[PDB]
Write a protein that binds this ligand. Structure first.
Ligand SMILES: NC(=O)N[C@@H](CC(=O)O)C(=O)O
Ligand SMILES: NC(=O)N[C@@H](CC(=O)O)C(=O)O
Ligand code: NA
Ligand code: NA
Ligand SMILES: [Zn+2]
Ligand SMILES: [Zn+2]
Ligand SMILES: [Zn+2]
Ligand SMILES: [Zn+2]
Lengths: 362, 362
């Protein structure tokens, strides 16, 4: 007996097209998504060229419409130069992404005044998300309060971060957050196995006490999102390894294992991979779309998953219970037992759907 | 220029059929819903006969399928006799409703042990909602904790109640709540105008400080819901007046006025009348469904609204800004400028849709 789930949403993926297509492209990344039970993804803008203006957005849109196998929205990225220039295209993007620390990106904002300018000029009804580690979470929350609007915090990893967000919610402040699976299922205890190259990620892996704090404060976590960040093994094992893990194909199996162990409920899971992603980002429903999972199947994660071009995974050797058996997307069978069955280009930009626009005042 | 909204959801309405059809029936109540921009309603079980067993549910389902003009789900009601007997039909209902105080109902539970039995026997993945006033909110929250599950609190009205729920959420407890428009827009200051008959409602109208506390703690309010409780003027003005107000046709106009005044944002409104109702009750999307409102139109609420058989309203004389211009439901024009255009029976039971079942473990 299978369980039917709605079409799950991952609001934080890196599909590397344009400019890094040896790591992943729209076609391979969305195949990995479907294989992990994900039918809609929001793609980050730290590509080459980065999606920081209208021409780059236009290019990315066509590449995604031609290559994506599942549906998608594309983030715009904040730069030191583009505040106040995105108003005509802002509504066509998933939202605006701010890079406030040193990760795999050059979209550096070198002053909190630049953060303020983006919060003041980006349309107030559209989403803003921030890469903000440790004390940076408090700093960007200050900027959100000074400009009287909401903010969403990407991949929360540490006790310090989730407790701060918890205190902000208790004061009624409009903040939401997401947590990625490696920060719930990996810790410093795993760095000896992974090694210093494979183990590079931002935010870095936390302590066992960080992981325990995230689980203890599950009520504070609005979304799960993979931060699918594919790099090749050659890159991860080389002299200057880039940070990030692939994760689309492993996220739901890991979380289903936790559900079967009683660590969280099926509803807890569906709030965080469907309902809350919808409502925070104003993402539309998907007609005739659902995911069938088998909760009984026990298996061990191999050295690489079938679809991501990253061709490695930090969860190798972990035992999981639960697997994706079939995915239907808008009335067509998209995935069955390891075979993707919709071609590149089947996926659509959900912000072009009439129901996919963010409502605003005239 | 109109604003397009998604199909709004009211999770707390009384449509009085079967048994009280002089107050309202499915056809008149759902016409009032469409006129107020509501495309799906959840109907309470305190009818005559009350919906407290499988035969009564079957009857109510057919009456709704034949009379409803918008889509719907039907609550089951908890009784002193039916704990442990609803398992075969539980999944077909919106949820289980507990009447824990003395309102317009005989579904009296005369012991917290009966509350415990319902929390233990109702399927753990399906919704439970409670009419729970003042200290009863704390008592039912205790029962939810003892049985390790969630609860939803109906029409929160007082500072005491919202602050208690706020403290529970700060402790991570799984509780949600709804607030009705009369407790945001009416107070003791209005009882002299209404009089003791028309003014009877449960929970009773609060003080100006109660109303200010609800607005101050908007972040704690998960849903708006009308508690549409129609009674005739003869009944409200008679010797033994029943409690309750009609409200489907006035709820969105009142809230749109508040939005135009800057008291809350359009997003705040759509979280509470669309996204959170969906996710708390696992209600499915509605294809090709939307509501067009005009935010500029200023008008005064008359002595009765066009569609509810209650033929009165406690908001008479209040000035509002905002009106529903057009509603489309599953591809058909359902309402335009005061004319309902879908017939009785157009509406469907959303729990029969494949996407409308609540997911559960096998
Ligand atoms: N380790 C990561 O997090 N890597 C991400 C960037 C990011 O999300 O910061 C990437 O794009 O490679
Ligand atoms: N005043 C009310 O609240 N009336 C409701 C009952 C209820 O919701 O308690 C009714 O059914 O009339
Ligand atoms: Na396409
Ligand atoms: Na019908
Ligand atoms: Zn990041
Ligand atoms: Zn990222
Ligand atoms: Zn009630
Ligand atoms: Zn009621």
């Amino acid at each position: 007996k299978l369980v039917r789930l709605p079409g799950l949403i991952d609001v934080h993926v890196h599909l590397r097209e344009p400019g890094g297509t040896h790591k992943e492209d729209f076609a391979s990344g969305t195949a990995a998504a479907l294989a992990g039970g994900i039918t809609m993804v929001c793609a980050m803008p730290n590509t080459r060229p980065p999606i920081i203006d209208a021409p780059a957005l236009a290019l990315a849109q066509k590449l995604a419409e031609a290559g994506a196998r599942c549906d998608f929205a594309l983030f715009l990225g904040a730069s030191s130069e583009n505040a106040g220039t995105l108003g005509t295209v802002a509504g066509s993007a998933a939202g605006l992404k701010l890079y406030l620390n040193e990760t795999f990106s050059e979209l550096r904002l070198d002053s909190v005044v630049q953060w303020m300018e983006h919060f003041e000029t980006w349309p107030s009804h559209l989403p803003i998300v921030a890469h903000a580690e440790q004390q940076t979470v408090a700093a960007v929350l200050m900027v959100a309060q000074l400009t009287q609007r909401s903010v969403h915090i990407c991949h929360v990893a540490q006790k310090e971060e989730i407790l701060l967000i918890k205190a902000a919610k208790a004061r009624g402040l409009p903040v939401t957050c997401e947590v990625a699976p490696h920060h719930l299922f990996l810790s410093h205890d795993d760095l000896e196995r992974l090694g210093p190259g494979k183990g590079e990620v931002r935010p870095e892996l936390g302590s066992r006490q960080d992981v325990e704090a995230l689980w203890e404060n599950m009520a504070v976590i609005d979304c799960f999102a993979s931060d699918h960040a594919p790099h090749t093994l050659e890159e991860k094992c080389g002299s200057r390894p880039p940070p990030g893990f692939p994760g689309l194909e492993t996220m739901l199996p890991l979380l289903l294992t936790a559900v079967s162990e009683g660590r969280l409920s099926l509803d807890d899971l569906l709030q965080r991979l469907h309902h809350n992603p919808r409502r925070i980002f104003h993402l539309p429903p998907q007609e005739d779309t659902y995911v069938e999972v088998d909760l009984e199947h026990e298996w061990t994660i191999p050295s690489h998953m079938p679809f991501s071009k990253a061709h490695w995974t930090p969860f190798e050797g972990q035992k999981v219970k639960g697997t994706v058996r079939r995915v239907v997307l808008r009335g067509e069978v998209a995935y069955i037992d390891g075979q993707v069955l919709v071609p590149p280009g089947y996926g659509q930009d959900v912000r072009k759907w009439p129901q996919g626009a963010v409502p605003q005042l005239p």
